[PDB]
Amino acid sequence: MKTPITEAIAAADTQGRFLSNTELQAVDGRFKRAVASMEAARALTNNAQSLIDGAAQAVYQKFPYTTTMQGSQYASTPEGKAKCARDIGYYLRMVTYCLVAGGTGPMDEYLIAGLSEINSTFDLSPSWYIEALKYIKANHGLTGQAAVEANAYIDYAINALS
Amino acid sequence: MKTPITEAIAAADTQGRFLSNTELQAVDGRFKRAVASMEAARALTNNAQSLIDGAAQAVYQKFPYTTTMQGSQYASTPEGKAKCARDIGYYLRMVTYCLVAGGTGPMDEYLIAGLSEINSTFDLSPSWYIEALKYIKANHGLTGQAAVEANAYIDYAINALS
Amino acid sequence: MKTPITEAIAAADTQGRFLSNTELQAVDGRFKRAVASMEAARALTNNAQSLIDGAAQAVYQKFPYTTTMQGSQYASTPEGKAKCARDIGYYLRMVTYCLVAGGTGPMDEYLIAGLSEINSTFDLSPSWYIEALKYIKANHGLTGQAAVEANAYIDYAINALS
Amino acid sequence: MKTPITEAIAAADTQGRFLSNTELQAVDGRFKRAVASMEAARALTNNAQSLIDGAAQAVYQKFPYTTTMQGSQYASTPEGKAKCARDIGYYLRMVTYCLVAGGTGPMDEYLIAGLSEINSTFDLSPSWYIEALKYIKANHGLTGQAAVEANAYIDYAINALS
Amino acid sequence: MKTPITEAIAAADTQGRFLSNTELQAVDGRFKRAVASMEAARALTNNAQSLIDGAAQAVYQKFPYTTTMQGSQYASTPEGKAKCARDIGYYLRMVTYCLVAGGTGPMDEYLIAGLSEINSTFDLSPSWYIEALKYIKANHGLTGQAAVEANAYIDYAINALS
Amino acid sequence: MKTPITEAIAAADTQGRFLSNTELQAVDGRFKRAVASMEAARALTNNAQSLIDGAAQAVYQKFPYTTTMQGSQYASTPEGKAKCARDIGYYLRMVTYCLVAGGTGPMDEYLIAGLSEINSTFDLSPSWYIEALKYIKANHGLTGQAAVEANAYIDYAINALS
Amino acid sequence: MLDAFAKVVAQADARGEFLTNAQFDALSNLVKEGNKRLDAVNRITSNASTIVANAARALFAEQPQLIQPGGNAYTNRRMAACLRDMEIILRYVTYAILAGDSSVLDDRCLNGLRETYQALGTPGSSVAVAIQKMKDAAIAIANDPNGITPGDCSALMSEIAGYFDRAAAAVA
Amino acid sequence: MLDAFAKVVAQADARGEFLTNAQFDALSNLVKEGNKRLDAVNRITSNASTIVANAARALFAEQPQLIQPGGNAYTNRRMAACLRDMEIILRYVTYAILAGDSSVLDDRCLNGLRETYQALGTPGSSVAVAIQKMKDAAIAIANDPNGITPGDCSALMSEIAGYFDRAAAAVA
Amino acid sequence: MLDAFAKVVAQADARGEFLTNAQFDALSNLVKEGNKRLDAVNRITSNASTIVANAARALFAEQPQLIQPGGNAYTNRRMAACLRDMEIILRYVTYAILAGDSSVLDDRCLNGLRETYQALGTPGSSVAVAIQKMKDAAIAIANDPNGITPGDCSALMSEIAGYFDRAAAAVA
Amino acid sequence: MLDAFAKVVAQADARGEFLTNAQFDALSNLVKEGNKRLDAVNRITSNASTIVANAARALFAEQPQLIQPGGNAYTNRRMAACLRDMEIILRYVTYAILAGDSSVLDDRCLNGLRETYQALGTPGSSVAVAIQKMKDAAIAIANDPNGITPGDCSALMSEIAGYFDRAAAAVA
Amino acid sequence: MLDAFAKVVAQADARGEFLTNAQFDALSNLVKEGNKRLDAVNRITSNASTIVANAARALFAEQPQLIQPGGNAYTNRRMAACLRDMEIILRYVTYAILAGDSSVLDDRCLNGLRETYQALGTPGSSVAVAIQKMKDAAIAIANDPNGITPGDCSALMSEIAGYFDRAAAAVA
Amino acid sequence: MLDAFAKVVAQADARGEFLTNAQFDALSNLVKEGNKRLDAVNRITSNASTIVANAARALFAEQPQLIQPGGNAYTNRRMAACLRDMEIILRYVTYAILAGDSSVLDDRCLNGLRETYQALGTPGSSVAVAIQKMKDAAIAIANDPNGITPGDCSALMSEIAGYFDRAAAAVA
């Protein structure tokens, strides 16, 4: 899994090298950044339910056809609405993992790999998830560097869906 | 050249990726560490002459046969003594480059690649340079994290000669 | 470009071989099938305008949000409606090329390669094109083997969008 | 084994692709050609004995030294004559396999691979087999497309021996 | 070109190595063997015409059909007889090159590479050349180690034709 | 293991070839050279003890700091003197193996591979071994081609240490 | 790989024999039934995406543990690879239908597959279920009376079903 | 590579156009003339060895300097490679005949060929001669009235001759 | 590749010199201005998809010939590759911003690029236009006063603009 | 590979859960103890050559059979490879210290290692001894009170010792 | 691989010893008997084609089932591969004769060979028979009194026979 | 590559001729002078390290700009590569001495070398100087009267000098 720490090791190991100051510095930056990352992960976790709920409605609001068109891919049935909220939960949870891990690894591994395939196979619009993610970004209530941290991984997901 | 910054880019570029937070954190650690590195580089530069001079004598002291045995590889002639001091200067200067660059790149590139070959071809004992480096480590007059920085690159050179 | 004829040659050339009866038979099947393919290509060409026009409306009908949501990706402006019809024309024209060429080559080359990228970048729903293609399939007025031919390349496109 | 059908699959599988119309057409040509191929295979099978017998003598006629020179490679002994007829039978039987299979696969696999080695090791003249094959071509009594089929695989063997 | 000398160099160069005693010894064996090789090459050169002439007739004797069957591949015409003698000359001349060079290189390069192709394309029986070579072996009038030398390259050719 | 014989085989086997005269000649040179090599190996073996003893002192003489500096790498203790003599014995014994084997193989395999690593890790000066080897060369009491043989492998070792 | 024709030739060569009159007749029937085979292949192939997606959806509906966190089809990577495998199997089954012989399916898809799933932790029984769903769907699409010259394709559907059953056995 | 059909599609796509009624008609003629094309390919291919060997023999007879020692076709390696090149050219010419387009010949055989011969010291003028000999032989075999349903293949022979001339121009 | 720090070390080594007091000071300023650099990189990177898509749309709007049939960005393959190139350039420009030096951009992106477009028929002038559009957008996003500690980043925006101009010069 | 942070995320994802307040706290402690970890890594790494050479010398002193002729560490090639292995192990142990997790050590160093030594004839028990010597030396260097801000690193030394013990178990 | 000389050196090094006077003497005998070894190698090699072809013919005469249809040496591919294997074995046996040691034969020919034949369905007992035939022929050719300086080569023929027996044991 | 013997054979084959009595005689002289050639090769090779190191030291003494910072042989990497090149040249020159022909030197060392140095910024004139120094040293060692059977090797030294001059011309 890609973290500042595993990248540092990977760089050394790729060359058959012991770790050098070159890498220890990278890891130190990770350790220092962790204060902001952890704040963000905690706040997003604590507020996850309202963020997810609010995010789901923001989608339904922007794309109301998703609540009315017939189809297993839509949120026009209770089961469809439940899958949609689950997915949004997934995204949010991955953001928090990225924050804890200090890198994109969890989202890369658990969510982004295969994403286009799954979206295209199950007829899910990336634009739906982007709206959910834009809502979360707008309303997570973080400021300062904790917000910069949350937003970097949220925008990473947005980029992966674009 | 290997620096925390070029490693960060290399990691992203290797994967066809934009930079992620994963890498920006590494670079931030580099920027924060630079305060200690730069202190060290400045002090070693300011005091380079006395360090080199003292280091040369520390070698001659430990290995006095180097000042008396006949041979172009020894410091038994004025020209040999001048080459020895030049080399020690080289090592010290490389340490300072590593400190400025925030990584081993300069020493790797300018000094370590080819080192064993040159030492074996010209009959130079690694143990000579190690003594010089041990002297510099002992007497650079740095404390705190500036000393940790200087010593990490000095010991790196020592390791490369062992 | 992939046609029964170029596949036959590719198979021989891959092995440094002259063409054998093995391949001439494949090409003969192509020549015999061409009667049905050419009927289909002619009818779809002759009727292209009404097919395109009907297909566009079938999309707007199934996805009426595409005619009302603001956005360059939608057909909510005259220019958007014109791009949509152009695209549908593209698909239809590619079907006819596949029929003339006796294979998927033209569609592979001119349309399918890059398709997911373009769809994801410009926020175009594959489901839109599939509806257009389903309309064309339903209403091209072909029967017998001419219809089997048209439908094989239309369903190929549908598969490529799924 | 190389047949129009296995070539069609090989082409699709090489690319990770489902079969397309491109390939089904090739297989259809094979199915249509099979009527002519099967006629030819049946007639050559029914008349195999007289063809083989006639072919053997045509060789002995053109190369009478093969019936008189001493040597295990020649047909100057009963056992040598029996091996010669067996071999000719082999060739004819392979032709019929090629016709049934709709391609060169059987002859490639069972006869042509290793052919030059075996001929050179056992001191067998390709020109002998070519004469046998020329006889069979001249006297198989097929006309129309059944003859075109038989001759394509007979000439294939001739080419492989040249 | 493959000689004991070029093999020795090739072995050293393959490993980025200077020549070692390992190789100088091989070359010395070559230099010592050259006395026997050179005797043989001289005698075969001096007597080339009668050897070639005798060898040609030995072929015609063993395979008299070659002097009577119609065909450009046979020696049934003046021009065919001239090509046959030329070829035999070629073989003999190559033997002498192998002897001078101390190795198979010349024959490998000038004669054996492509040999099976040329023989099969122009319908030339290897057995013809083998008889020519057997004659030369029988009648070159060498004894001792000069004969061992000549025979090693003659049998090499025989092997290449078998 | 690299010997004239194994090189000869390696050259043939690399090409899927039977041995040719090209290689037998190399092996013959080896067999002829063996008379000189074996003389040398016997004399060096018979006189090994005095050669080793004399060689050790020649080192201590040229580098007297090796008998006085404190350190496990030096011969300033009984155990250090014993390791030094052992090593010199090793070199001499390897020379004799090279002579018996007719090539560098034993020394390559048992001594040279890893040599720089071991020398650098244990802080052993190549110049020490070279002096030992120069002594052995000067005092082995061989003349003629037996001396040429011994010296070729001794200088090979010297080269490997330079 | 072999098709049905090469299969017969291979058996005959092992015996050193010319084809019998019965074998020619058999193989002529195969040829006569060729159009139907091409229709089946066309139809299944032309609907490959929905066969797979509908079969996936059915699987996960019946076995929700596969897509619960920790589940073998949980995460998009594992989902994508699962869908992929369903695609791969359907692909080789259609090759087999074209060839009239399973050697391509056996050789290039089915061999090593059980061992592969066993090593990954992928439940083969679940794969078998997905294959059976695709089978039922493939056959309904292939054997649809609408839009095709009427005739009986029952033998063919039996054969087709056989490749799917074979595949499901290989993993279960 | 392109065949005659893809060639037309490629031209049409560059214009963004549907095929005209004239282009359909043209391409339908191509299809109607298909059997003759298959005969030509069959015939030339079925006689590939003699076309080449007879053309080689004719070449060396007319230019004995090529097989004198020092000559470009002297030694068996150089002979084998020469024969090979004649085989290669004939092969790609037959591909071109099948495709009804020279792109395979141009792309995969003819490009870089002059420069290649120029670098080796192989006289291109001699190659051209060998190609022309194969041409004359290929066409006599392809256009032989015996053992084939009577009709006119003149257009086709013109086309065929064109691929051979093209090849000979590319090296000369 | 070099960053701004290694760049100075490389110049100094070529002279055999220790760093001067002026060079330490310079490099300390670089470090002091580090946060701003990280913000720029973050911001541009975090908005990479819209910068590219918005710049593509603007390009094709101003030069519709590029997406007319026959056009260099017509067909999805050519479109995809165009978008890709815009992605690639933006990527290397951001590397350059991080490094404070263009060597990565020059070495790994910009060299051979003009020649490459010239060989393909891709109009470099059009590429330059797309780069400039991305530049304007990248800088507006990077230099947005909202949601960031107030300060002046003008020097940095100048530097950033310089990498984009450099890139556009390299292809135009 | 995983670090201590990714390790927790991986466990949480398998459950489909957000992190608990207890897990955040744990991971915040890890971060708070980060400097000490960096010191350990620095110190062990900065002294890698002497740790290995001193441990080798100690090994061969206690087990002279390893360097007697016939011995597994006799000849320079076998010596070099032995020293190498000691280098490799120490390297991966330090990676593990940095990561706060052994997955890199287990995955990339320790797996297959016993089987490898068993196949070569290398006595694993001897390797274990060398690892333990390096352990004792690594820890004395890492936990040296001189020249470092005073504090307790005992937990860390326990962890470090654990990676070395793990390594020694894997081969013994 | 080892030759007889390196074999002795390798044994001596494992003991850490200089060669004894008895070993020098032995190895000097080997050298003294060198010419005979070169003759054997020359003779067998110079007749390699007939040894193999005559041994193949004898094999198939005694075991006609091998070349009946279905048989392991039936079809030219299987025949060619069989002849090949006989060539390969004879080749490595001659290497072994040159080296005076079987390590090249064991290492590069004989190891894995039984398992290989067992996997293919090739009857090893038949291979052994072919090897023995080549042996008898190789030795008659090598030990032919005609055209060579008279002497006794019996020891050598015993050694040679030993490599062939070894080879036959390895497959039987 | 060619040796002096193959060189003659190659010239003769180009003419289609048997060797003349004059050529046999020449080549017999070469053989007769073989020992001296082996001595030269042995001697130069046995002293390869000092020839190179002494020539390097002499070069840098006469051209100190090469090892001043910025200089082409400054830094250990550039030094190592320089020494290497001197090693490489000496190596191929000794191959050439063994072969009695420069084809190995020309083909595998000298071709492309000037262009290579021109591209790197390596001054060829300096390389030439180093080659000449090695030449003078190689020849003094090869032609040393001490410890060798007295005779005249002047012709050989001329030849040797020729390979070195050739090499120096190729780079200068």
Ligand SMILES: *[C@@H](C)[C@H]1/C(=C/c2[nH]c(/C=C3N=C(/C=C4\NC(=O)C(CC)=C4C)C(C)=C\3CCC(=O)O)c(CCC(=O)O)c2C)NC(=O)[C@@H]1C
């Ligand atoms: C021009 C770019 C605009 C701008 C920049 C700006 N930032 C600061 C302060 C900070 N920027 C960061 C950003 C990071 N540190 C990291 O490690 C990473 C990657 C993990 C990032 C993205 C931080 C931590 C700070 C300090 C705390 C804070 O939030 O301010 C300033 C103030 C001066 C400074 O350098 O610290 C400025 C000016 N601000 C503008 O107005 C420009 C539009």
